[PDB]
Every structure is written in C-alpha cells, then in structure tokens.
Write a protein that binds this DNA or RNA. Structure first.
Ligand SMILES: [Mg+2]
Ligand SMILES: [Mg+2]
Ligand SMILES: [Mg+2]
Lengths: 249, 255
DNA sequence: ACGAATTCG
DNA sequence: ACGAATTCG
C-alpha cells in the first residue's frame, strides 16, 4: 500500500505574517492529505492552532515551550502506540530527537524527527547529534521500519566526517537518483522570506530510512510550499518535502 | 658588547608593536627602543609598523638599518644592527588573497661569518580568517624550504596561529622547527598575547595565545639557546609598549 | 538561517 | 585583536 508524509520546517520563529503563513501551511497539507507530517520550529500558539485545524491528526510534540518539533499522525490510517524523546545533552538551541512508534500500512514503524543544531559555527555539535540519530535508527527490531525526516542543517562534508550513512541506512533523495527538481530545500534566490540579499542554497531537509530489503520503497519526492501567499511571502523560508513510499509486507 | 666568545651567536627580538594604536604611540615606541638598547639584539623583527614609527626608530634605535615590508598603511620591518650584519638583499613575497595587506618579507644577510635568510610576516588576523591564515603559513613554510641549502633560514613573526590550525596544515615540515618547542615548551614564555596580564586593548575578558612564533630550518647546525619575553613593564602612561609581548631569542650557529 | 561586519563585555 | 551577540548586506 502507498503512504505519504511531509516534513517541513515552518519557521514559527518568524513572527511576521505568521497567522497567514500557518493557514498557508495547512492549505498545503489539505491538498496532499499526508498520512504523517513532521514539523520543525513549531511554537505554542502555532501548536494550539494545529490542534484545532488538524484535529483529524494525533499531534505529538517535542516540547511545550520555546520552539520545537511535532509529528502529526492521520487518525484512521496511523495507530499511535508510544512516543519517545531523546535529549541532545550539549544543544544550545533546545534541540532533541522525537520518535513515535506506530502501525501504518500493516507494518510497525518508528518515525523520527529533529531540528539539528543550526548554522555553520555549530557544525561539531550538529555532527554529534547526527550520530545520536543514526545510533537510534539502529535500535529498532529488524522487522520495524525506521523513517527519520527533519531539518538536519547538514552539509555533505559533515556526513562524510560522520563516517557516511551506515550500510543499512538510506537517504530517500539519493535512493531516487538525486533528482534536481527537489534537491535544494532552503534557497535564498527563490525564497525571499529572510530578506537575505544574496543567493545560497542547501539540502538541509533530509529523509533517512532503515528497512528490511524491499519492504520500504520510495516512489516520489517533491517540494511543497512553493507558492506565495496573499502577503507576498511564502509559508516558510524552507520548502517542505512530500514523499510517497510503498510499504511491502 | 658582543665579544669573541659570542661570535657564534645570533640574538634577535620579534615583536608586534601595535602601531595601529595611535594612543601614546611615541612613548610606547620609546619603550620598545629602551628594550632594544638593553639587549642590543643583532636583528629585530617588527609587525604593525607605520610610517611615523619608522621615524621614532630612526631617532631612538639609530644603530639599526630599517628594511620595511611596505611604504604606507601598516607593515612589517626587519632591523639590522650596523657593524654586525651585512645587508645583501631584500625580497618581498605577496599574499595574493590577503584582505589586510599582509605579505612575507625576507632579508638576506651575512652575520658572524654565515649567510642567513631572515623572514617575517604578520599572518591574517582573527579566528574568522583561519583559512587564509593557513594558506599564508603554507607560503611561508614553502619559502623556508626553497632557500639554498647552505643558507640558514629563520622566520620570526606574528603568526596569529592556534595549535589546531598547524595540525590542519599537517604540522611543521621535517626540517623546520619551532624554537619554543625545541626548548621544551617552557611555561614562562608560552603566551605572547594575554588580555588578563595586558590591558592595552581594554578587552574585559581573559584570553591568551601563542601568536608570536619562531621557525628555523636546520642538522644540528642551528641550536636555540634561550627564549624569553620582553615588554612586560608598564610605561609612564600606565600602558604597555604593545598589546603583545615580544620574544627575545638567542641561537648558536654550529659546525 | 547565508557570510561579513560590527558592537559589547 | 578575545568570543558572544547583534546587525548589515
Ligand atoms: Mg529557521
Ligand atoms: Mg516509481
Ligand atoms: Mg594587532
């Protein structure tokens, strides 16, 4: 059976046009009706909005104050079994690792998200956090399918410094042949929200998975959130990623 | 005076004398020159010299010939004791990507019956410019290796280096030694820039670094004898000659 | 949440 | 000529 999710850093720390941009995020979610949504940079009033607007999803959060991650699980498609939060002891930005154990498509999943330490200056801590994520991905039983989707803030060289992805962990964008149309998820030439008067682009938002051979097969990957809202800005400074996969029992 | 017994020795001071701080500069220059008068080094390597400072050196260090790394702005200089050092030529090597007018100054001399290439630089400043500083260090080390095998090469200057940056470079080449390391990393002269002990910059924090370093290319032919700090006395104005301490080094040239 | 510049302690 | 924090482009 086919499943879909979106992962999206929705820039709740930008207070400008935030109500309109939150409505814009959810209009995108309504269009694609994903089974799972992974969000980063949620803030408390944004979470309160989602609890009403997305009342058809079970909402799991990474914290209750500041800014944090969330995982939304479509009721009637996804059975919620537990949540786990793993700290990043040396974060300076309240980052952590949020996991949920669920049933979806007839199989058990561990679904994970994080907003890894931001900016070039904090590369070393970001690498330590990536190692924590990768270590946690190895802990689930082999019959459980593990998906991480989140804002990694990664540069390719940092993954190399980490040792590269393990032999049994795959990046969905790489798996699909490194398609150019959805490569960059943060692009200051195409996205004006931060008003950065220069052109930089990065593949900060990434999807990793661990599954028994042939039991999880990515089928599509697309950017979402590409349309300006009435205020002339985008829902976020990031594009979202929409991924569909076949879950084979 | 430098008699027969010490004819095998080269002594020198290297010092970033902070000519970019105009406040109290004439008095601070007199403080530097008082140090030069006390130790009478054969050679002085200076960084952050400015044109007015050259005039102060001509007045209060008149026994030294001045070779400069540029004519305007701020620049390095090598001072040669008249009657001891024979000047043979001056070479300047550019750092094409510097944003701070930095370069490599080489002065070829004869002293004590030996040929020397004496080099100084003020490598790119601040943690943010690490990449360019490492590129400049590679230029310096390459030039040290290129000199004729008969010549004795000494670099002394303000490197702005952090230890981790020399490791990123791959370490000093096999025939190039750091004088402080050679002498066993003595604690008394380890830090040459120290905002707890020196308040010239008025930084309200305590940080210390070994920015000022001496490299030499040598087998057993060049033996460091001593390394000591200078410039640790406050002057009449209540400030030091510079935000850096200077380094006083003696080396023996051996058969 | 970019790199470069600047301020503050 | 420090590092952190903030601001500029
Ligand atoms: Mg952000
Ligand atoms: Mg297909
Ligand atoms: Mg200086």
């Amino acid at each position: 059976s086919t499943i879909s999710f979106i992962t999206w850093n929705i820039d709740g720390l930008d207070g400008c046009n935030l109500p309109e941009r939150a409505r814009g995020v959810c209009s995108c979610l309504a269009l694609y009706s994903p089974d799972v949504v992974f969000l980063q940079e949620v803030i408390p009033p944004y979470c309160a909005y989602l609890k009403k607007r997305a009342a058809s999803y079970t909402i799991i959060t990474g914290n209750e104050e500041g800014y944090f991650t969330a995982i939304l699980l479509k009721k009637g498609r996804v059975k919620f079994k537990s949540q786990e939060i793993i700290p990043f002891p040396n974060t300076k930005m309240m980052r952590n690792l949020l996991c949920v154990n669920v049933s979806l498509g007839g199989n058990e999943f561990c679904l994970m998200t994080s907003h890894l330490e931001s900016t070039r200056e904090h590369s070393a801590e970001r690498i330590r956090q990536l190692k924590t994520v990768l270590g946690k991905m190895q802990e689930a039983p082999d019959s459980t399918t593990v998906i991480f989707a989140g804002d990694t803030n990664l540069r390719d060289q940092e993954v190399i410094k980490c040792g590269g992805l393990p032999d049994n962990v795959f990046d969905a964008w790489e798996f699909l042949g490194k398609p150019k149309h959805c490569q960059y998820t943060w692009d200051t030439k195409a996205n004006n929200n931060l008003r950065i008067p220069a052109a930089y682009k990065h593949r900060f938002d990434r999807i990793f998975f661990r599954a028994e051979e042939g039991h999880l097969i990515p089928q599509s990957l697309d950017l979402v959130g590409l349309e300006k809202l009435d205020c002339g800005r985008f829902p976020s400074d990031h594009w979202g990623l929409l991924c569909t996969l076949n879950v084979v029992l």
